[PDB]
Amino acid sequence: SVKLAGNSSLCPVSGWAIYSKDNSVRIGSKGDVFVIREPFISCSPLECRTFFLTQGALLNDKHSNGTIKDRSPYRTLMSCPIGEVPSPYNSRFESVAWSASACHDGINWLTIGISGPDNGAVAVLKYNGIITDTIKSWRNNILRTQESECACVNGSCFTVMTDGPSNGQASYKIFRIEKGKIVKSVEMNAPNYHYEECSCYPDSSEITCVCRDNWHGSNRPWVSFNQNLEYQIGYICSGIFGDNPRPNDKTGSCGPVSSNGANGVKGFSFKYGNGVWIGRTKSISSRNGFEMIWDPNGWTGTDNNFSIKQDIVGINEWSGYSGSFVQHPELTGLDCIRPCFWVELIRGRPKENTIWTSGSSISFCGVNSDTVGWSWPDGAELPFTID
Amino acid sequence: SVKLAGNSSLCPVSGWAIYSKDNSVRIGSKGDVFVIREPFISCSPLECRTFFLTQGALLNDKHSNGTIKDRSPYRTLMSCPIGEVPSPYNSRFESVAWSASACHDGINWLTIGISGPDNGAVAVLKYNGIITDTIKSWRNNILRTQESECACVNGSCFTVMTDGPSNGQASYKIFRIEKGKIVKSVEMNAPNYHYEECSCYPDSSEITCVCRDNWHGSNRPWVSFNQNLEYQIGYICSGIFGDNPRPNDKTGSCGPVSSNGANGVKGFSFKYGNGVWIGRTKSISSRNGFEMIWDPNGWTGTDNNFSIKQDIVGINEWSGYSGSFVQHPELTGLDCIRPCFWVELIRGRPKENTIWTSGSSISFCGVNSDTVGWSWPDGAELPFTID
Amino acid sequence: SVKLAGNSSLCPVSGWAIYSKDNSVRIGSKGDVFVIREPFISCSPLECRTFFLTQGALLNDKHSNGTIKDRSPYRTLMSCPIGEVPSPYNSRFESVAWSASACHDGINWLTIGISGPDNGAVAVLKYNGIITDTIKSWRNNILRTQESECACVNGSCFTVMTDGPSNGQASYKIFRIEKGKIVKSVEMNAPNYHYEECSCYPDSSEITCVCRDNWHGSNRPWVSFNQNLEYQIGYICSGIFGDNPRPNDKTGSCGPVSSNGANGVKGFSFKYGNGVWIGRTKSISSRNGFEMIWDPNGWTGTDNNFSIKQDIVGINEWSGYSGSFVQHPELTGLDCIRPCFWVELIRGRPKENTIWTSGSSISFCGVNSDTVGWSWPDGAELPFTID
Amino acid sequence: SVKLAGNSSLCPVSGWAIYSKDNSVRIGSKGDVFVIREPFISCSPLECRTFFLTQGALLNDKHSNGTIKDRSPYRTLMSCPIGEVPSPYNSRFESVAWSASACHDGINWLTIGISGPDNGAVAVLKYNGIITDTIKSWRNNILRTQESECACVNGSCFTVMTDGPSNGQASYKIFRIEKGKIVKSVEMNAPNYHYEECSCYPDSSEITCVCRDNWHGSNRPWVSFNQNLEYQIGYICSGIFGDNPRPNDKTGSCGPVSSNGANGVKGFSFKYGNGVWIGRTKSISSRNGFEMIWDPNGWTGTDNNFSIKQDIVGINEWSGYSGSFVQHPELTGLDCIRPCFWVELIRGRPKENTIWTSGSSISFCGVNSDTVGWSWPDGAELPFTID
Ligand SMILES: *[C@@H]1O[C@H](CO)[C@@H](O[C@@H]2O[C@H](CO)[C@@H](O[C@@H]3O[C@H](CO)[C@@H](O)[C@H](O[C@H]4O[C@H](CO)[C@@H](O)[C@H](O)[C@@H]4O)[C@@H]3O)[C@H](O)[C@H]2NC(C)=O)[C@H](O)[C@H]1NC(C)=O
Ligand SMILES: *[C@@H]1O[C@H](CO)[C@@H](O[C@@H]2O[C@H](CO)[C@@H](O[C@@H]3O[C@H](CO)[C@@H](O)[C@H](O[C@H]4O[C@H](CO)[C@@H](O)[C@H](O)[C@@H]4O)[C@@H]3O)[C@H](O)[C@H]2NC(C)=O)[C@H](O)[C@H]1NC(C)=O
Ligand SMILES: *[C@@H]1O[C@H](CO)[C@@H](O[C@@H]2O[C@H](CO)[C@@H](O[C@@H]3O[C@H](CO)[C@@H](O)[C@H](O)[C@@H]3O)[C@H](O)[C@H]2NC(C)=O)[C@H](O)[C@H]1NC(C)=O
Ligand SMILES: *[C@@H]1O[C@H](CO)[C@@H](O[C@@H]2O[C@H](CO)[C@@H](O[C@@H]3O[C@H](CO)[C@@H](O)[C@H](O)[C@@H]3O)[C@H](O)[C@H]2NC(C)=O)[C@H](O)[C@H]1NC(C)=O
Ligand SMILES: *[C@@H]1O[C@H](CO)[C@@H](O[C@@H]2O[C@H](CO)[C@@H](O)[C@H](O)[C@H]2NC(C)=O)[C@H](O)[C@H]1NC(C)=O
Ligand SMILES: *[C@@H]1O[C@H](CO)[C@@H](O[C@@H]2O[C@H](CO)[C@@H](O)[C@H](O)[C@H]2NC(C)=O)[C@H](O)[C@H]1NC(C)=O
Ligand SMILES: *[C@@H]1O[C@H](CO)[C@@H](O[C@@H]2O[C@H](CO)[C@@H](O)[C@H](O)[C@H]2NC(C)=O)[C@H](O)[C@H]1NC(C)=O
Ligand SMILES: *[C@@H]1O[C@H](CO)[C@@H](O[C@@H]2O[C@H](CO)[C@@H](O)[C@H](O)[C@H]2NC(C)=O)[C@H](O)[C@H]1NC(C)=O
Ligand SMILES: CCC(CC)O[C@@H]1C=C(P(=O)(O)OC)C[C@H](N)[C@H]1NC(C)=O
Ligand SMILES: CCC(CC)O[C@@H]1C=C(P(=O)(O)OC)C[C@H](N)[C@H]1NC(C)=O
Ligand SMILES: CCC(CC)O[C@@H]1C=C(P(=O)(O)OC)C[C@H](N)[C@H]1NC(C)=O
Ligand SMILES: CCC(CC)O[C@@H]1C=C(P(=O)(O)OC)C[C@H](N)[C@H]1NC(C)=O
Ligand SMILES: *[C@@H]1O[C@H](CO)[C@@H](O)[C@H](O)[C@H]1NC(C)=O
Ligand SMILES: *[C@@H]1O[C@H](CO)[C@@H](O)[C@H](O)[C@H]1NC(C)=O
Ligand SMILES: *[C@@H]1O[C@H](CO)[C@@H](O)[C@H](O)[C@H]1NC(C)=O
Ligand SMILES: *[C@@H]1O[C@H](CO)[C@@H](O)[C@H](O)[C@H]1NC(C)=O
Ligand SMILES: [Ca+2]
Ligand SMILES: [Ca+2]
Ligand SMILES: [Ca+2]
Ligand SMILES: [Ca+2]
Ligand SMILES: [Ca+2]
Ligand SMILES: [Ca+2]
Ligand SMILES: [Ca+2]
Ligand SMILES: [Ca+2]
C-alpha cells in the first residue's frame, strides 16, 4: 500500500472508449435498485467504484414519491462496483449525505458527506470508514460540495465547497486533507465568479477544477492550485459554451458569459495547454444528449472553431450531470494519469410524468487508439407501475 | 491480530457527528428486508457491524404478522455491515436468539444468544462462530441480556444478565468471559434496584453500564466494575431524567425516582467524572424524539440544569431503544476510546395500525469538532400493503 | 492448510445446544429462496455450510409445482453459509444432482452429485470444484447416496452408496476417496440388511454410519469400518426404535425389527461404547416432532429404558430428515471430535395442501454444559399465494 | 501467479460428465435474473465463470420486450460464477458489448466487448478491467467475434473477428494479444469460406478454432494457427454434418456443404488426429436437442459412420448455441488440457409466444471414466406472466 504520486501529466487522448453502463432504471423496474442521483466514479489502486446519493428508497416503490426533492435526512452516500446497479444487496454504506465527494489516496478511501439543516449543515469526513473531521457551514446557506471525486497528490487530497446563494455571489473554499483531516483551507477571492459542483483532477502535481456557474455564466469557471493552495481562477474562453442552458456557439469570453447564464448543470473539461476537451449536452436549453469536443485553443481562445466532435448520447435522449474521474499510473501501469468521464442519465421529474426522479450512468476512458461516436442512453420506458 | 487493550480513557466530546442511517423500513416496503427489533452496533479492529434480532420474516409479508410478540423460536441474531439494510442476502447468521449481546476482543467475535422457554432459557456463547459455553436460567423467569454490545479489556469481555420479574425485584449477574468461556460471575447485591438491558462500555480498564429500571425508576441505574468483578452500584442523580416514561425534569435522586418509574426503554449514558452525556427521548410519555444532553454535574448532582442539548430525532417522530458502542484506538489510531451511539426507530405496533413491528437505525460518534442538531427519523409511510 | 487428523474420540455430551435456524420457508413467502429438500451441514477447518438439493425453482413461484417429485434434470447440489436461507444470491453451485454427499478433508471440498436416468445414474465427484472421478450405477436401479456429509480421516474420505430396490434386498458399497479419486471400494456382504441414506462420522480413526432400512426394519442398521474398508455390520439393539414409522417402544432386536419396518426416514445416532444418542421423530407413524434420547446400553441392549430425553421439535409440528455432522479439533481447538446434528423441517406435499414440497432447517451441537428442551419448528403458514 | 503454458495436448476422452446447470429461466420467473443470450464459460487458474451478454433488463419485466433484437446500446458483457443464475446481485460488470470474448492468461482476465453502430463498431479490450486497446471495424459491417472464450498460450491470447456480410463472402482476422494489447493480426485468405462465432482452444502450443459458416456450409469451417499466426484452413469432412440447419447425414465434403448451408448456429468440435468429437443439435432444421458424437476419422474422412453417441438434450427440447472451454493443467493438476463444453438453452422468440428471448445453460467436461446420456433441458414453463 503506497500513496498515489500524482506527479505525471494527463495522458493526451484522441477519443473516448466506452467503459461502463449500469442500466439502473431499466433493471429497477423489477429489481431492488436504489432511487439515486448525483452519481460519480472514483478509483483506488485496485478498483473503480460508482458513488451515489440514495433517496433511502427503491425504484417502483411508494417511497420513491417526491424524490425531485434535493435534501432530506434519508439521503445517504453509498457505493458499488462500477457498472453494477446500485442495490441494497451490493452497495457499501459510506455516509449520511445530501451532497458528497470521495477519493482514494493510495492507502484508504476519503468520503465527505454533508447532512443537517440548510442553515447549518456539517460535512462529515471519513478515512477508511472512521470519522476523522467535520466542517460546518460558514455562511449558513446550504454548505455543499463536488458530487464527484476529490483529487489526490502524494498523500494529500483536495476538494472545493461552496456556501451561500445559488443565484448570486457566494463563498468558495479549497481544502487540503491528509488521512481525512483538514490541514489547510483558503477562501477563494473570486468576486463576480460563481462555483458549484467542481470536477477536479490531478495533473503534474497540481489540481485543476472545472465547475458550474449557476448565477450568470454559460461558460464554465475554473480554479487551479498547487499543494500549498496557491490558486488561479478564470473561465473557459471557448465560444463552444460548456454549460446547460447556454446560447448557440459564437465568440466566447474569458469571463462569465451572461447570455443564458443563470442555472446550469454539473460538468467537467480537461485542460491540455491552451486546448480543452469539453463534455457537454447536445441541447442548448435542456438536459438532452451528450458529446465530447476537442478544441485545441479553447482554454484561452474565444473562437467557436473546434477540431473533433464525438457523439455520446443522442439529442433526443435524456442526459444530466457529468464529471471527471482519473485512473492513476498505480492502477494502470501507464506513465501518465488517464482521463475518464461519467454521465448521469436522469429519468423522471421534472421532465417526465412520474412521482420520482432517478438516474443511471455511463462512463468512458480516453485513449489514442480508434473510437466511435454513438448514443448510449438510459433506455427505460416511463412511466413505471408505481406512477 | 492483537487483543484490544481497553486501558485508555473515554474521549471527551463536545457533540455528535452522524455516522450511519440504514432506511430499513422505507427500503423493505419493496426490498427483502428482515423484520427486526433490538438492533445494536459493535466494532472489531477492522469494521463495524449492525447486530439485530430478526423475527424470521420479511417486511410486507404475511409472516410479519404478530411481531409485537417478543420471544419465539423463529427469532435469530444476525448481523450486517453498518448502514446496510438487514437482508437475507447480506446478513451473517450468528445465533438462535430472542435476547442477545456481542463484542469483539481484538481476535474474534463473541456472540451471546438466548433461546428456549421462559421458564428455562439458555444463553449460547459462541467465539468465532463455534459454541464455547452455555448458561441456563437461575430464576426460571426469562433469562435475558443487554441487547447491545458487551465490553472487552485485555482479552476478557464483560456482560450483565437478568433473571426474574420485569416489574419487581429481580436477580442481576455480571460475567467475565475469555475466548467465549465464562471464567467468573458474581450476583449483584442490589436490593430495591432494577437492572435491564444494560449499555456497557470500557473506560480506563473498567466497565461502566447504564441500564433500565422497569420496576420503579424513571432515572437510570448503573453498575461499574473492574476486571475482577468488584462492583459499585447507583442511579444517575440528574434531574434530567433519562428513562421513558418519566416525569418532567425537576430535582432528581441518587436512588430510584418512583414517579412514572414503572416500565422503561433501553438507553445509555456516558460518565465523565461527575458529568454525564444523557441520550433520551424528547417525549416524557411515549417513544418519540431523541436528544443528547451534556450535564456537567449530572452523574452525582440532583439539579435539572444542563449545558448542551443536541437534537437527534424530532419530538413528533418515532424513536425507540438506544445504546452505546465504542471505537477502540486499535481501530481509530486515537489515544482514547471513542464513544458512539445508536438509536432504534421503531415502526408499527403498538402505536401504529399495522400487523407488524420493526425498526430502522441511526448512529452517531462523539467528536470535538463542529456538529449540528437535526432530525433523522425513520421516514417510512405506514400502513404498508400487507396491512 | 493441513489434512484433518480424525484420530481423536467423539466428545462425550450431556445435551444439545441450538446452533442454527434458517427460517427458509417463512422467508421464501416473499424473498427469493430455493425450493429445496435433503439439506445437510458440513464443516471445513474455517466454516460450516448448509448443502441442499434444489429443485431449480423458487418458493411461491409456478415452477415450484410438482416438487414432491424426487429426481429430475433440474435438481442441483448447492451450498450456503450455515443459518442463511438458500437463495440464488448467496448460494455456491456445487454439482448437478438428485442425490448427494460432501465433506472437507482439511485442504478442499469433496462433493458427490448423482444425476442421469434411473437405470444408469452416474455419481460425479469433484475436488475443489474440478471433476476428479465418476462412478456409474452397477445394478441399474437408482444409484444413490447419503444426503449428509461424508467422513474424513488423515486425507482419505469415506461414503456409502446403494443401488437396487428400496423395498427389498439391494447392494451397498463403501468407498475410500483421496483428492476426489476413488482409491478403494468394497461391496458389503449384508444379506437381509437394508441400507439407505447413511449418516457417517469419524471417531478414533474409524468410520461409523447409521442408516435407514426401508425394506423391513424399524430400528436403524449400522456399518462401521477402518481406513482399509474392513467393516462390521449390525442394527441398533435398543427398544427405543429409531426409524419412522415404527412401533411403540418395547423390547428391541439386534437384527431388523419387522414391525412397521417398511419405508423410513433418513436419520442418525452417535455410538459411545454400548450406549447411544438417538435422534428421532416424536410420532411413531408420521414425520412429526423431534427429540434426542441418551440410552446408555442402547447400542447393544434390547431394553426400552433410557436416561435422558431432550425435546427438539414438538409432536404437533412437521419434522423430516435428520443427520449427523461433526466439528473437528482443527476447527474448534478441542481435543475430541464434536458431534452435532441437523433436522430438515419438511413443508408442503404430501401432508399439506400445496403444489410444492420444501424444507427449512435447524441444527444443534453437543455440549457438557447446561441445555434445555423446547420446540423450534418451521413456522411458515401454509398454503402460500401460489397454491 | 504464473502464465498458463498451453503446451500439453488435449486430454483424450471417452465421454462427458455433467459439470453445471444454472436453471436461469425457471428461477427468473420470480427472482431477479438478467435476460441474456450468447453465454459462455471460461476459467482462470482458480475458478470458472459464466460470461454472458445481458439485454440490460430482467426476466418477467416489461424491459424484456423486443429482446429478439441482437444489438443495442443496453447490452453488456457480465460474468458470474459457473452454475449460478446471472443476477444483478451476483454478477461482475465486464464491458458494454453486443458481441464478446474473454480468457484468462494465468495472470489476469482479458475481455473483448464490441459496441457502437453497425457501420463502425469498436472492440474495447480490457486486461484486469482496465482498457488496454481498441480495434475498429475495417469493413463497416457489424464487427463481431467469438461469443466464447479466447485461447491462451505462454502469455499470448488469440481470437478471431469477422466484418462483412453474414450471407456472403466476408473478412476474417486472427489476433494475438498480450496483456490486453494487440501485438499482431493477420487477415485470413479464405475465398469461398465463411467464418462466424469461432470456438477456439489451445492444444500443444497451437490454436484450433471450429466456427459457423452462415453463407453456404452445413458442415463447420476450421482455422488453426501457431503463435506467429501462421494458419491453415479447411472444413470438417465428416458426413455427420455439424451445423444447424443441415441435411440428413450422408457423404460429406472437405469444403463447404451447400445443401441447407445458409444460416447456422454457433458450435464447436474437438480434433484428435484424424478424429473429431462433434457437438450438435439433434434436429436438422431447428435448434432442438443436443448430442456428442465421436467420429474417429471425421476430421478428414467423408463417411457418415461414427463410434460413440452420447445424448445431452432430448430432441423435443430447446437447445441453442454451444462452445468449447478448457481447463488447463495449472487449474486441474493433470498433464493435459481438459476439454469441456457448454450449451445455451434458448427460450422465447422466435419459436415461442413470448415478448422476450433469453437462455439458460448446461456444461460438461470430458473424462475417461464412466458417463451416461440423458436430457438436461431448460425446464421453464412458457409463456410467463409478462407475456
Ligand atoms: C394477521 O393476523 C390477524 C389476526 O389473526 C388476521 O386477522 C384475522 O383474520 C381472520 C380471517 O379473516 C379473522 O377470523 C375470522 O373472524 C370472523 C369474525 O370477524 C369469523 O366469523 C371467522 O370464522 C368463520 O370462518 C372460519 C373459516 O371459514 C371458520 O373456521 C369459522 O368457524 C367461522 O365460520 C374467522 O374467525 C379475524 O377476524 C381477523 N382478526 C382481525 C382483523 O383482528 C389478519 O388477516 C392477518 N393478516 C395477514 C396478512 O396475515
Ligand atoms: C411489448 O411490445 C409490444 C409491441 O409494441 C406491445 O404490444 C403492442 O401494444 C400496443 C399498446 O397496447 C398496441 O398498440 C396499439 O394498437 C392498436 C391496434 O391494435 C391501436 O389502435 C393503438 O393506437 C391507438 O391508441 C394510441 C394510444 O391511445 C393512440 O396514440 C393512437 O393514435 C390510437 O388511438 C395502439 O397503436 C399494439 O397493438 C401492440 N402490438 C402487439 C400486441 O403486437 C406489448 O404490449 C408490450 N408488452 C409489454 C409488457 O411491454
Ligand atoms: C511527499 O510527501 C512526503 C511526506 O510524507 C514528503 O516528505 C517529507 O518532506 C518534508 C519537507 O522537506 C520533510 O520535512 C523535514 O522534517 C525533518 C524532521 O522530521 C526536518 O529535519 C527537515 O528540515 C524537514 O522539515 C520530511 O522529512 C519528509 N518526510 C518523508 C517521510 O520523506 C515528500 O517530500 C513529498 N514529495 C514530493 C515529491 O512532494
Ligand atoms: C496419514 O497418511 C499419510 C499419507 O500422506 C501416511 O504417511 C505415509 O505412510 C506410508 C505407509 O507407511 C508410507 O509409505 C512408504 O513409502 C516409502 C517410499 O515412498 C517406502 O520406502 C516405505 O516402505 C513405505 O511403503 C509413506 O512414506 C508415508 N508418507 C508420508 C508423507 O508421511 C501416514 O502414515 C498416515 N498417518 C496415520 C496416523 O495413519
Ligand atoms: C514522480 O514521483 C515518483 C515517486 O516518488 C518519483 O520516483 C522516485 O524518485 C526518487 C528520486 O528520483 C527515487 O529515489 C525513487 O526510487 C523513485 N521511485 C520510483 C517508484 O521510481 C519520480 O521522480 C517523480 N517523477 C517526475 C518528477 O517526473
Ligand atoms: C495500555 O496498554 C498498553 C499495551 O499493552 C501499554 O503499552 C505497553 O506497555 C509497556 C510500556 O509501559 C511496553 O512493554 C509495551 O511495548 C507497550 N505496548 C505498546 C503497544 O505500546 C500501555 O502502557 C498502557 N497504557 C496506559 C495509559 O497505561
Ligand atoms: C493424532 O494425530 C496427530 C497429528 O498427526 C498426532 O500428533 C503428531 O504425532 C507425531 C508423532 O507423535 C508428532 O511428530 C507430531 O508432532 C504430532 N503433531 C501434532 C500436531 O501434535 C497424534 O499423535 C495422534 N493422536 C493420538 C493417536 O492420540
Ligand atoms: C511445457 O512448458 C513447461 C513450463 O515452461 C516446460 O517445463 C519447463 O521447462 C524446463 C524443462 O525442460 C525447465 O527449465 C523448467 O523448470 C520447466 N518448468 C516446469 C514447471 O516444469 C515443459 O518442458 C513443457 N512441456 C513439454 C511437453 O514440452
Ligand atoms: C446549484 C448547485 C446546488 C445549490 C444548492 O443545487 C444542486 C442542483 C441540482 P439540479 O440538478 O440543477 O436540480 C434540478 C441538484 C443538486 N442535488 C443540488 N444540490 C443540493 C446540495 O441540493
Ligand atoms: C423489561 C425488559 C424485558 C423483560 C422481559 O422486556 C423487553 C422489553 C421490550 P419493550 O420494547 O419495552 O416492549 C414494548 C422489548 C424486549 N424484546 C423485551 N425483552 C425480552 C427478552 O422479551
Ligand atoms: C429409500 C431411499 C430412496 C430410494 C430411491 O428414496 C428417497 C426417499 C425420500 P422420502 O423423503 O422418504 O420420500 C417421501 C426422498 C429422497 N429424495 C429419495 N431419494 C431419491 C434418490 O430419490
Ligand atoms: C451469423 C453471425 C452474426 C452476424 C451478425 O449474427 C448472430 C446470430 C445470432 P442467431 O442466434 O443465429 O439469431 C437468431 C445471434 C447473434 N447475437 C448474432 N450476432 C450479432 C453480433 O448480432
Ligand atoms: C405522493 O405524495 C403525495 C404527498 O404526500 C400524496 O398525497 C400522493 O398521494 C402520493 N402519490 C402516490 C402515487 O403515491
Ligand atoms: C493482560 O492479560 C495478560 C494475559 O494474557 C496478562 O499477562 C497481563 O498482565 C494483562 N495486562 C494488564 C495490563 O492487565
Ligand atoms: C401444476 O401442474 C399441473 C400439471 O402440469 C398443471 O396442469 C396445473 O395447472 C399446475 N397448477 C398450478 C397451480 O400451477
Ligand atoms: C514464453 O514466453 C517468454 C516471454 O516472456 C519467452 O522467453 C519463452 O521463450 C516462451 N516459451 C516458449 C516455450 O515458447
Ligand atoms: Ca450557468
Ligand atoms: Ca477554438
Ligand atoms: Ca423505568
Ligand atoms: Ca446539572
Ligand atoms: Ca424402516
Ligand atoms: Ca436401554
Ligand atoms: Ca450454415
Ligand atoms: Ca467416420
C70 an active-site residue? yes
Name the phi and psi angles at C201, rounded to 5: -140, 155
Neighbours of B291 (CB within 10 A): 18
Give the end-to-end CA distance of chain B in Å, rounded to a whole number. Answer: 49
Contact D164, D172 (CB under 8 A): no
Q: What is the largest CA-CA distance in chain C?
A: 53
D 244-273 residues with CB < 8 A to A:
none
Judge: C93–D87 Cβ closer than 8 Å, yes or no.
no
Contacts (Cβ under 8 Å, ≥6 apart) of A40: A50, A51, A52, A102, A146, A147, A148, A149, A323, A325, A342
Region for residue C164 given its phi and psi (left: phi exceeds 0; alpha: psi -120 to 50; beta: otherwise): left
Using a CB–CB cutoff of 8 Å, tell me whether B89 touches chain A. Answer: yes
Contacts (Cβ under 8 Å, ≥6 apart) of C170: C139, C141, C162, C163, C164, C194, C195, C215
Gap between the Cα atoms of C336 and D50, Å rounded:
42
Could you tell me the distance, in angstroms and rounded to a whole number, from the CA of residue C39 to the centre of ligand 8? 45
Give the total residue count for chain D: 387
The experimental technique used to determine this model is X-ray
Using a CB–CB cutoff of 8 Å, tell me whether B20 touches chain A. Answer: yes
> Residue B275's beta-bridge partner residues?
B272
Helix (H, G, I), strand (E, B) or coil at D119: coil
All three cell numbers of C174? 463403501
Of C347, C356, C352, nearest to C60 (Cα)?
A: C356
Taking CB atoms and an 8 Å cutoff, what residues of chain A touch B21? 56, 73-74, 76, 96
Gap between the Cα atoms of B121 and C55, Å rounded:
37
Q: Name the residue facing C89 among D87, D376, D380 (closest C-beta).
A: D87
Residue of C nearest to B92 (CA): C84
Of C187, A125, A225, C21, nearest to B113 (Cα)?
A: C21
- Provide the annotated binding site of A: 37, 71, 196-197, 212-213, 217, 243, 261, 263, 287, 295, 297, 303, 305
Nearest chain A CA: its distance from D130 CA (Å): 7
Nearest chain D CA: its distance from C61 CA (Å): 6
Number of H helices and number of E strands within chain A? 2, 24
Judge: D327–C96 Cβ closer than 8 Å, yes or no.
no
CATH number, residue D105: 2.120.10.10
Contact D247, D262 (CB under 8 A): no
Contact A274, A307 (CB under 8 A): no
Gap between the Cα atoms of A235 and A224, Å rounded:
11
Residue type for position D199: S
Name the phi and psi angles at C381, rounded to 5: -110, 110
The one catalytic residue among A32, A70, A249, A387: A70
Gap between the Cα atoms of D172 and D186, Å rounded:
9
Gap between the Cα atoms of C37 and D229, Å rounded:
53
Gap between the Cα atoms of B263 and B297, Å rounded:
26
Nearest-10 Cα torsion for D250, D255, D257, D261:
150
Contact B92, B76 (CB under 8 A): no
Residue type for position B231: Y
Number of domains, chain B: 1
Q: What is the 3-state secondary structure (H, E, C) of chain B?
A: CCCCCCCCCECCCCEEEEEEECCHHHHHCCCCCEEEEEEEEEECCCCEEEEEEEEEEECCCHHHCCCCCCCCCCCEEEEEECCCCCCCCCCEEEEECCEEEEEECCCCEEEEEEECCCCCCEEEEEECCEEEEEEECCCCCCCECCCCCCEEECCEEEEEEEECCCCCCCEEEEEEEECCEEEEEEECCCCCCCCEEEEEEEECCEEEEEEECCCCCCCCEEEEECCCCCEEEEECCCCCCCCCCCCCCCCCCCCCCCCCCCCCCCCCEEEECCEEEEEECCCCCCCEEEEEEEECCCCCCCCCCCCEEEEEEEEEEECCCEEEEEECHHHHCCCCEEEEEEEEEEEECCCCCCCCEEEEEEEEEEECCCCCCCCCCCCCCCCCCCC
Tell me the CA distances in angstroms from A124 to A36, B47, B365, B371, D316, one per residue in order.
20, 18, 11, 9, 62
Looking at residue C78, the DSSP 8-state letter turns out to be E
Helix (H, G, I), strand (E, B) or coil at A209: strand
Gap between the Cα atoms of D336 and B255, Å rounded:
81
Name the phi and psi angles at B330, rounded to 5: -60, -30
Give the end-to-end CA distance of chain A in Å, rounded to a whole number. Answer: 49
Helix (H, G, I), strand (E, B) or coil at C130: strand
C259 lines ligand 4 (CB under 6 A): no
Contacts (Cβ under 8 Å, ≥6 apart) of D301: D237, D238, D252, D274, D295
Residue of C nearest to D369 (CA): C134
Name the phi and psi angles at B79, rounded to 5: -150, 155
Tell me the CA distances in angstroms from A363 to A20, B276, D16, D102, one per residue in order.
5, 51, 42, 21
Name the phi and psi angles at D330, rounded to 5: -60, -30
- D7 CA: nearest ligand 16 atom: 13
Contacts (Cβ under 8 Å, ≥6 apart) of C269: C199, C210, C220, C222, C236, C242, C276, C277, C278, C279
Using a CB–CB cutoff of 8 Å, tell me whether D54 touches chain A. Answer: yes
Name the phi and psi angles at A127, rounded to 5: -120, 125
Name the phi and psi angles at A289, rounded to 5: 75, 170
Gap between the Cα atoms of C173 and C164, Å rounded:
12
Residue type for position D162: T
B235 an active-site residue? no
Residue type for position D140: N
Using a CB–CB cutoff of 8 Å, tell me whether D46 touches chain A. Answer: no
Cell 428391541 found at? C252
The one catalytic residue among D32, D70, D118, D387: D70
Using a CB–CB cutoff of 8 Å, tell me whether C117 touches chain D. Answer: yes
Residue type for position D72: S
Gap between the Cα atoms of A65 and A57, Å rounded:
9
Name the phi and psi angles at A63, rounded to 5: -75, -10
Give the end-to-end CA distance of chain C in Å, rounded to a whole number. Answer: 49
Q: Strand A171-178 relative to strand A181-187: parallel, antiparallel, unpaired?
A: antiparallel
Contact C198, C223 (CB under 8 A): yes
Neighbours of A144 (CB within 10 A): 24
Q: List, in sequence order, the alpha helices (H) in chain C.
A: 24-28, 329-332
Residue B7 burial (C-beta neighbours within 10 Å; 0-12, 13-18, 19+): middle
All three cell numbers of B376? 433523522
All three cell numbers of B57? 420474516
Contact A229, A185 (CB under 8 A): yes
- Whose atoms come closest to the Cα of A245: which ligand? 17
* Parent domain of B31: 1-387
Name the phi and psi angles at A42, rounded to 5: -155, 150
Interface test with A, best of D36, D61, D118, D385 (most A CBs within 10 A): D61
Nearest-10 Cα torsion for A306, A312, A314, A320:
-100
Neighbours of D49 (CB within 10 A): 24
Helix (H) or strand (E) run with residue A27 in it: helix A24-28
Could you tell me the distance, in angstroms and rounded to a whole number, from the CA of residue A53 to the centre of ligand 17? 23
All three cell numbers of C4? 484433518
Cα C212 → chain centroid? 10
Q: Name the residue facing A74 among B26, B87, B331 (closest C-beta).
A: B26
Neighbours of A189 (CB within 10 A): 9
**Buried/exposed code over C285-296 (b: 16+ C-beta within 10 A; e: otherwise):** eebbbbbbbbbe
Could you tell me the distance, in angstroms and rounded to a whole number, from the CA of residue C135 to the centre of ligand 13? 63
Name the phi and psi angles at C365, rounded to 5: -125, 145
Contacts (Cβ under 8 Å, ≥6 apart) of B320: B265, B287, B343, B344, B345, B346, B359
Contact B123, B163 (CB under 8 A): no
Which of C62, C63, C64, C65 most suits a substitution to test ligand 15, by most atoms within 8 Å of the C-beta? Answer: C65
Gap between the Cα atoms of A141 and A132, Å rounded:
24
Taking CB atoms and an 8 Å cutoff, what residues of chain D touch A377? 73
Residue of D nearest to A24 (CA): D56
Residue type for position B236: I
Residue type for position C291: E
Judge: B48–A129 Cβ closer than 8 Å, yes or no.
yes
Helix (H, G, I), strand (E, B) or coil at C121: coil
Gap between the Cα atoms of C319 and C311, Å rounded:
13
Gap between the Cα atoms of A98 and A73, Å rounded:
8
Of A376, A363, A367, nearest to A41 (Cα)?
A: A363
Could you tell me the distance, in angstroms and rounded to a whole number, from the CA of residue D70 to the centre of ligand 12? 7
Gap between the Cα atoms of B3 and B107, Å rounded:
6
The upper half-sphere exposure of residue C8, i.e. CA atoms within 13 Å in the direction of its Cβ, equals: 18
Contact B78, B34 (CB under 8 A): yes
Nearest-10 Cα torsion for A214, A215, A216, A221:
-50
B283 lines ligand 14 (CB under 6 A): no
**Order of strands across the sheet that contains A92-96:** A34-43, A48-58, A76-81, A92-96
Name the phi and psi angles at A324, rounded to 5: -80, 150
Could you tell me the distance, in angstroms and rounded to a whole number, from the CA of residue C65 to the centre of ligand 15? 6
Gap between the Cα atoms of B45 and B334, Å rounded:
13
Could you tell me the distance, in angstroms and rounded to a whole number, from the CA of residue B195 to the centre of ligand 19? 10
Looking at residue D169, the DSSP 8-state letter turns out to be -
**C263 marked as binding residue:** yes
Q: How many CB pairs under 8 A join A and B?
A: 107
Cell 436477580 found at? B171
Nearest chain C CA: its distance from B14 CA (Å): 42
CB under 5 Å of ion ligand 20: residues: B 295, 297-298, 303, 305
Using a CB–CB cutoff of 8 Å, tell me whether B33 touches chain A. Answer: yes
Contact D38, D344 (CB under 8 A): yes
Helix (H, G, I), strand (E, B) or coil at C64: helix
Contact D145, D114 (CB under 8 A): yes
Of C70, C72, C108, C90, nearest to C27 (Cα)?
A: C90
Helix (H, G, I), strand (E, B) or coil at C322: strand
Helix (H, G, I), strand (E, B) or coil at A358: strand
**Buried/exposed code over B163-191 (b: 16+ C-beta within 10 A; e: otherwise):** bbebeeebbbbbbbbbbbebeeeeebebe
Helix (H, G, I), strand (E, B) or coil at D358: strand
Contact A22, A307 (CB under 8 A): no
Give the end-to-end CA distance of chain D in Å, rounded to a whole number. Answer: 49
Q: Is the Cα torsion angle A287, A291, A297, A303 positive or negative in sign?
A: negative
The one catalytic residue among D19, D231, D235, D321: D321
All three cell numbers of A135? 466542517
Gap between the Cα atoms of A13 and D101, Å rounded:
26
Gap between the Cα atoms of D1 and D24, Å rounded:
33
Q: Is the Cα torsion angle C234, C237, C242, C245 positive or negative in sign?
A: positive
Cell 468521464 found at? A341
CA angle B285, B288, B292 (to 5 degrees): 105
A68 lines ligand 13 (CB under 6 A): no
Tell me the CA distances in angstroms from A289 to A236, D4, D374, one per residue in order.
21, 45, 53
Cell 451441537 found at? C365
Gap between the Cα atoms of B366 and D256, Å rounded:
77
